[PDB]
Symmetry: C5
Subunit: 202 residues, 5 copies
Amino acid sequence: LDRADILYNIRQTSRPDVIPTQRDRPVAVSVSLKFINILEVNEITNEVDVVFWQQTTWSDRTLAWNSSHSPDQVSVPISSLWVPDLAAYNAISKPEVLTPQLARVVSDGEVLYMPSIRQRFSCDVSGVDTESGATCRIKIGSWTHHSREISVDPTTSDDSEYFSQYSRFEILDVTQKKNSVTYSCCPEAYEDVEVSLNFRKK
Amino acid sequence: LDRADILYNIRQTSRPDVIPTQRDRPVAVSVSLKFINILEVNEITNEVDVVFWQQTTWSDRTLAWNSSHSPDQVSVPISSLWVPDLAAYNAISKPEVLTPQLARVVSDGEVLYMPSIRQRFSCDVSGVDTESGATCRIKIGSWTHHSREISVDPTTDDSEYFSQYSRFEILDVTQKKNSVTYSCCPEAYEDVEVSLNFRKK
Amino acid sequence: LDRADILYNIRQTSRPDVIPTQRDRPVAVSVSLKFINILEVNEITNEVDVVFWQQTTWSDRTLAWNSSHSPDQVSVPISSLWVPDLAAYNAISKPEVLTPQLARVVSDGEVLYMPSIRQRFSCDVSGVDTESGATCRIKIGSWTHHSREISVDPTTENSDDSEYFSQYSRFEILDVTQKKNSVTYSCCPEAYEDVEVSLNFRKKG
Amino acid sequence: LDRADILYNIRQTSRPDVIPTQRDRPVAVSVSLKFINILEVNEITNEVDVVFWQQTTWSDRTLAWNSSHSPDQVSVPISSLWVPDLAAYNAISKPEVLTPQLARVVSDGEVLYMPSIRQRFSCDVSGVDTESGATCRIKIGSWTHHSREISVDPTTENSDDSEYFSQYSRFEILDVTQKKNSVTYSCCPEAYEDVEVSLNFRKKG
Amino acid sequence: LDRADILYNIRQTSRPDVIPTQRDRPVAVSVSLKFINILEVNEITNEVDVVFWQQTTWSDRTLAWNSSHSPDQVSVPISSLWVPDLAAYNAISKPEVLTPQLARVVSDGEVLYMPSIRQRFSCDVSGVDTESGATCRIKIGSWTHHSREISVDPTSDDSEYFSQYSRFEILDVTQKKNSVTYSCCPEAYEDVEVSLNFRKKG
Ligand SMILES: FC(F)(F)c1ccnc(N2CCNCC2)c1
Ligand SMILES: *[C@@H]1O[C@H](CO)[C@@H](O)[C@H](O)[C@H]1NC(C)=O
C-alpha cells in the first residue's frame, strides 16, 4: 500500500460519528497537556490565558492496515476520523486551535492528535506574584460519553520542558490526577483528567 | 443493532428540518440553566457576561430503536437531529458554545442536549454590590414556533456547579414558565424566565 | 400534507439563487426595524451599536401548498429559500445575527424572516444627552436589485416604538419614523429603493 | 430564457477557477474605490480604518446569453463566477465584506462586483490634523496574475469617488486620484499591475 | 492544453490530503518570510504583531503538464492542492491570511504559495528601543511530518518589501535550519528559524 491508498481507504470508510469501542469496553483516551505559554493572568477575575499542546492518543482498529511494504504512519485530517468529544469544564472561551487539524495514524490503528490550543480558564490565580506561586487546575473529559464508553488517563518532564523562556511567568510544577464523578441526576460515571499548573510571575 | 447501525439509521432518516410533533400536539421542550460563572458585570450599562449549561430535553420518536441486545443511548452530532430553535430574547451577543455539539439520544427517542454557553445579556445589574444583590432575568423560548408547536417548561443546589473562583456568588435561582403575545403576531410564544439573584463577594 | 412533506418539497425544489418575480413585476419586500437595545453611543465618532428585529416579508408563490388538512405555516432554514439581498448603506460592521436562521412560510407563499441583529452604524449622534435627543437615520435596500426587480416598503406598525425595547438600556426611544426613498447613482441608470428609518433617542435621566 | 434558466446555466458551466482570457490577451479589470467612511486614524502608527465600495468590472464571455425574450441582467453569487484575485498590498487586516456577495452579470458577459469593504491600511497619515491634510496611498492589484494575464486600470469616470462619503465622519476628503502602476520585485521578472488610490483627507475643524 | 483543461485536470485528480513524496524521499519545502510590517510590540509581555509574506515552494509532479503550446503557469485554489502543514511553534494567535488563497503551479509541478499573514508571536522584544534593537526568532516547520517526510530549508534586501510607514525598521533578517527530537520518538522535526533584528525608529 502507498500513502494515497491508505488515505483513500480511511476517507472512504471513515465513520467520524462512530466511537470505536471494542467488545463493549471503553475507548481508552490518554490526555497530556504540554504547557507552551501563560499570557494575560488576572488575579482580580481569577482568569488565565494558556497555550498548550493537547497530546491525545486512542486506538481505532477500523483504521489499521498491513504495514509490511507500506508506511508505518500517515497524516489524516481530523474531519475524516472519530475524535473524542473532550471539553475543559472550567474553560470560559472556545479552544483557539493554532495548528493544522491533522492527526497521525499508525498502521495498528493508534491515533495521535496534538493540536496547539490557546484557551482562557476560570481557576485560582491567587499567589501568582509570590515564591510558592498560583495553582490553576484544568479539568478535561468527554462531554457526552460516560466511563463505560470513554476512559481518560493522564500520561507522563515534557509537560513543562517546552515552555516559552519569553513568558512573564515560569512553571514550578505540573501534576495530573484522574477523577471519576457520578452526579445525582444520572446513574453513569464521567471521567476527567485534572491538571494542576503551579506557576508564578518571574 | 450496534452503535454504527443506529448512527447510520439516524443520519439517513432523522429529518433535522422537521419538528417531531405527534398528532398536532406541541413538542414539550424542558429547559433548565445551571450557572457555571459570572465573568463581567457592568452596573452602568446593565450588561452581564454569564457561562451556563443549558439542559434541553425533548422526545423525537423517529429516532427510537429496539434496545434489545443494543446500546440504550448514543452520542449524535446536533447537525443530524432536529433541535428546538431556542433564543434568549435579552441576549446582546451570539451564544458562544464552549462544548462539542453532540446530544445524547436514548433508544425511546428522548434527546438530551446540554451545551455550555457563554453569552452577554441586557438585564437589571442594580444592587450587585449590596447584601440583597442584583436580579438578572434571562428569557429563553422558540424563535419561530408558537405554543401550539413548542411548549417550554422548567424542569422540576443553585450553585452546585458554580465556579468558586468567580468574583460573584449566587443567592438564588428561580425558573418559571411565561407566555408572550406580541402586536405583530396573534399566537402566544412560551419561554422559561430564569431569575439569577447574585452579588459581588 | 404533513410538515415533513411540505419541508421535503421546499428543500427539493428550493432555488435560493432565484428572485421570485411574478410576470416581470418587482418582488414587494416589507422591512420594519423593531429596536431592542442601544448599547454603545459615541457622540465624538458619530457611531452607534444597536440591537433590532428586522421584520422582513415577501411573497414566493413557488413555496405555496394546498392548506386543506395541512399546516397553515412551517419554519424553514433561510439556506433553503431566496431571501432579499438587503444591506444597511451606513453600517460599519457586518450584521451579527443573534437568532436561529429560520423564516416562517405560510401556505400561500408569504415568507416572514425576523432575525435579531446587532450592528454598528455611522449616523448623527449629536444631541443624544439633550431633551430632544439624537436622530440616527438607518438606510436599508437591495444591494443589487433595482426598483423593477425589488420594491421596499415599510410594514404596518400597530404598537409602541419601545414595546420590545430593553428597560435596562442607558437610552430611551422618543420616536421611530420610516420613509421610502428611490435613488439613482452615477454607476447605474436604474433607481434603487430603500427604507430610511429615523431612530430619535436620548440618554436617560 | 428566464432568470432560473440563466442562473442554472451559469452555475453549471461558469468555471469559477478559470480566468476568462480571450486569445491569450490579459483580462482587463477596472477598479474604482468609492470612499464611504474613515473611522480610525493613528498618526503615530500610520494606520487608517476605511470603508469603501470596490467597484470591479470585467468581461467573461462564457457567461453571455441571447437577451431577446430574456432579462438583460441577473444577480449571481460570486461563488458561481470567476472573480479577480485583487488584494490591497498595504492592507494590515482581512477585508471585512459588509454587503451580500452578489455580482451583476449583463447578457453580453460584462460583470459588475461592488462589495462594501471595511479594511485597515499602513499608509502616510502625517498632516491629517493640518489644512493640506494627509495623503494615504492604497495599492490594489492581482495577488497571483501578472500583467500578461490581468491588467488593472482605473475606470474612465471617477466623478463620484466622494459622492457617497458619510457627512458624520470625523474626517473630510480634499481629493481622490486613482492611477495605474506596475510592481516588479528584484527576485522575480514579472510585473503586477495595480491601481494606486491617493486619498487626501483631514480631521474636520 | 489551455488553462481550462489544466485546471480541470488538477481539480479532478487533486489528492489534497496526500503528501507528494517521490520514492520515499522527503518533500523538500522552501520557506522564506518577507517582512511587510511590525504593528504592535510589547517589551513587558515579549509579544509582537507582524505582517509577512510566507514564500513557500515545493514540487508536486502529479500536477505537471506538457507546456508545448500551453501556459507555463496557472493560479490554483489551495483547496485543490496538497500544501505543507506549516505552523509557527511560538505563535500565540491563528495565522490571519490577508490575501486570496491561490498558489502558482508551474508546468513542471513546482508550486509557489505566498500568502500575506498577520500573526502574533511570543519572542524576545528586549532592546527594541536601543541602537542594536531586538532579535525576535520565529520557528516554522511541519506540524505532523518528520524529516523523512518533509524537509524545510531557507531559500536580497531584508527591507525591499518592508513598509516605510512602520514605527519600526529592520536591521537584519537571517534564516537557519533547525531539528527537534522529542524523548518518546526517534523522529526529528525540521524548522526554519527566522531571526528578525529590528528597532523603533529615531
Ligand atoms: F510532548 C512533546 F512536546 F514532547 C511532544 C512529543 C511528541 N511530539 C511532539 N511534536 C510537537 C511538534 N509537532 C509534532 C511533534 C511533541
Ligand atoms: C425487540 O427485539 C426483540 C429480540 O429480537 C424481540 O423479542 C421484541 O419483540 C422486539 N420488540 C419490538 C416491539 O419490536
